[PDB]
RNA sequence: UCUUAAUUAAAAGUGGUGUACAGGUGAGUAUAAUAUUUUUUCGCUUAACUUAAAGUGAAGGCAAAUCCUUCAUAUUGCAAAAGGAUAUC
C-alpha cells in the first residue's frame, strides 16, 4: 500500500519533515521511492514584519502528488490536512458550527 | 355447485402436469445448447 | 447443555420396544463425535467393534455400540414412532414425545408434515395439553414447530375445548386467552417457526399465519366470552380492559376477513389444491370441526359489540357469520353419520351435548 | 469560545458525567465545584487541581468535547429520568394490515405507552425490539413483559483500555507454565506432604 | 427450592487481520553470478490499495459462526461466494 506520509528529521526539540511516496509497512526513515517536498511544523515570521503575523513554509510537487493520489495512494490524516488546503481533497474534519 | 364440489374437482393433476412438463423444457434446453455446441464445431473442422 | 434423551416411564411393553428401538440405534449414536459416529456403521470396523466396541459414559454407565447394518439393522423410524404414539395412554406416557421428538430432531429425521398435527390431537384429547404447549415453548430442543397451516389450527381448536368444557369460566377462560397469544407471539416474533413450508402457505393464503382470520377468530372467541360474564372494583376494571381489546380485535379481523366470503372462499383457490397446504379444509369433516368455534365466535361477538352501540362491526360480524353459516350448514348435510365433525358441530353450534 | 452546554435528564451533573465515562474519574467529583467548571478548565488548570495522569486528563478533555458536540454515549438522548433509572417500553403501530412496527421508547415509569404523546413519546437510539415484548440493548435489563430499566452504571460511555491475558503474546506460555509449577507445589504441600 | 425461554454485564475462548512490519546483532560467510547497466521486445500476478461491473442461493459437522465439508448457479463447459448491522411505515 503506498502512502503519502512524512518522515521525522531534524534535531532534539528542531522539528523537520519529508513528504514521501513509501510503503505503509516500512521504516519511517527508510529510502523511500520518491520525495514529493518538505513541511516545518515550527511557525515562522517574515523578517521585516512587525504585524506579528506567522506562517508556515512547506514545499511540495503537486504535480507528482497528484499522480499518486490518482492511482490509489493513501495520505496519512497529517498529509490529509495539507493535501485539502491546497485544494485536491476534501477535509477529513472540520469545526462544528452548532 | 358448492364450495365443496368445486373444491374437490380440482387437484394436483394439473399442477403435477405442469412441473413435470417445465423440467423437460429446460431438459431440452440443455440438449438444444449442447446440440448448438456440437455445430459450432462440426464447421469449424470441415473449415480447417 | 441438555440432558441425554431417556424413557424411564412406559406403561406398555410395546411402548418400550419402539422408544427403545428408535433410542439406542437413531438417538444415542447422535451423542457420539462425528468420527466414531462413522466406524459403527462401517464393515471395515466390524471385527474392531466386536473386541472392543465403542463406548460413551452416560450417566456414568458406557454404552456400548457395535457394528450396525445401516440397510438391514437400521429400523423404520416412520413406523417405530407410530407404534409408540399409538400406545400412549398415561401422561407418564405423553412424557415421552419431549425426549423422542427431541432425538428425531437431532438425528435430522425429516418427519411427516402432518405428524404435527396428529401429535397435537391424540395427546390434546387425552388431556395433556401442556406437553404440547410445553414443546411448542421449548422448539429449541424439540424441533416441534408450528411450520403447518394445520397444526396451528389443529393446537387453536383444543385451547378453546378446553376452555368451553367448562362453559368458559374465567379461571380457564383467562388461561386459554394467555394460550391463544402465546402462539400469536411464537409465529410472529420466533424465528424457528418460520421455513420453506411455511413461506409456501403463506403465500397460498396471502395472511400470515399471527394474521390468519382463521387464527385470529380463535383470540376473539375467548376474549367475546370474557366480556359476555360482566358487561368487585378490581374485576371492573380488568372487565373494562376486555371490552377494549374486543372492540380492538373484532375491529381488525373485518378488516382482513373479506366480505361475504366463508371458509373456503377466504384463501385463494391454488391454497385447496396441494394435499400438503390447506386441503384438509375440503373434506365435511374437517371443516365442520374447525368451523365450529369459529362461527360461535361471530355470532356472540357481534351480540356484545352491538349493544356497546356499533352498527357497522353489529353488520360486518353478521355478514362473515351468515357466510360462514351457510357453508358450514352444506358440511352437516354431506358428511357421514358417526364423524368427529358432525358431533362437535353438534354440540357446539346445536348445544344439544 | 467556551461555550457550556446545558446538562441532560440523564447526565444532570458532573458527578454523573464522571461517573459514566469510567477510567476511575469519579474520585475527581469534588476539583469541579460547579458544571460550568468542568467545562471551562483548561489543560493547564486540570493539572494543578491534580486530574492525572496525563492519560485520564487527556481522556476527559476529549469526552468534554463530545458532550458539547452531542455526541453521547448510550442511552444519552433520554427524556424521562428519576434518580438516575429510565424505563424503556415498546410502542407499537400498524403499518400495514398484515405487519407492525415495533420502537422502543422512553416514558414515565408510570404513564402507558398509548397515553403519552407524541411529543414525549421519545424514541431512544441504540435499542431495538427482538420479535414481540423484548428490547435488545446495552445495558437494557428486563422489568417485565415489555419493559426495561436503564440505569447509570460506572463505565457505562467508557472505551475500555485493552488488557494482556496471561502476559499477551510473547509471554504466554511462560506465563501458564509457572503457572503450572506454582499449582503442582501447592498440591505437594497439601496432600503430598 | 426445582425446571423452561430470554435480557444484561463480565471472564475465558472460537474465528478475521496483524505478529512476512518495526527493533537487535555481526557469529557464520571468500565472491564471476541464470549477477548487473543501456536500448529494443515481453510475460506473470488467485491478498492489500485505486476505478467499475456482475453475483451474493441450498444443506451437513462442532455449543455456534463471516470456522470446516459440500452442492446449485456463473459466454459453450470446467471453475465461486457469508453473512452481519441501522433506519423508515
Ligand atoms: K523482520
Ligand atoms: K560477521
Ligand atoms: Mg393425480
Ligand atoms: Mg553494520
Ligand atoms: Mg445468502
Redesign the pocket.
Known sequence: ??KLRLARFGRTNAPFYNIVVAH???????KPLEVIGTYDPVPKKDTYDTTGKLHKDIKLDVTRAKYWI?????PTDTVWRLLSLVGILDPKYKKPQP | GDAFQRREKANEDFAIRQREKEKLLELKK?LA??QK?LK?LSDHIDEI | ???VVSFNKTSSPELKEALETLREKVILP?YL??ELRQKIFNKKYEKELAHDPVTIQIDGQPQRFSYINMLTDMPNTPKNIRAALLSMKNGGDFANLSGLLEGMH?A?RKLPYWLSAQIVRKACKAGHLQLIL?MV?????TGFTLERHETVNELLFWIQRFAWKSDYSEPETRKALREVQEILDALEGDE?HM??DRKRQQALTRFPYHRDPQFLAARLNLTAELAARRATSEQQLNSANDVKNLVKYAEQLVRLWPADKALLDMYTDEAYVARVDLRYLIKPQVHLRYASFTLQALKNAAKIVGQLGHGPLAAQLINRAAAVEAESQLAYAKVDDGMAGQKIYEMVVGGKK | LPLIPKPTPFVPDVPTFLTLIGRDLKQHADKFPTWEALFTLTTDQLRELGVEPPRARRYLLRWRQRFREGKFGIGGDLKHVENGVAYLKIHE????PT?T?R?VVNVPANQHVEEVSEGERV?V????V?GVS?????????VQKGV?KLAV?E?MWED?RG?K??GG?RR?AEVRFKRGVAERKALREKMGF
Not at chain 1, 505503509?24 to 527508510?30: F, I, Q, Y
Not at chain 1, 490518482?70 to 493513501?74: F, I, L, N, P, R
Not at chain 4, 403501530?93 to 400495514?96: F, I, T, V, W
Open positions: 500500500v503506498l505503509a509497512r516500512t521504516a519511517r526513515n527508510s490518482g492511482v490509489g495512494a493513501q | 440443455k445448447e449442447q455446441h459450432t | 447443555t441438555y440432558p447422535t463425535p462425528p437431532r435430522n410445553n415453548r421449548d422448539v429449541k430442543r424457528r421455513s420453506k | 403501530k400498524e403499518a400495514s405487519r412496527s420502537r424514541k437510539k441504540g435499542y431495538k427482538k423484548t428490547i435488545v440493548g446495552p445495558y437494557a435489563l428486563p426495561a452504571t463505565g475500555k488488557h491475558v496471561d503474546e504466554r
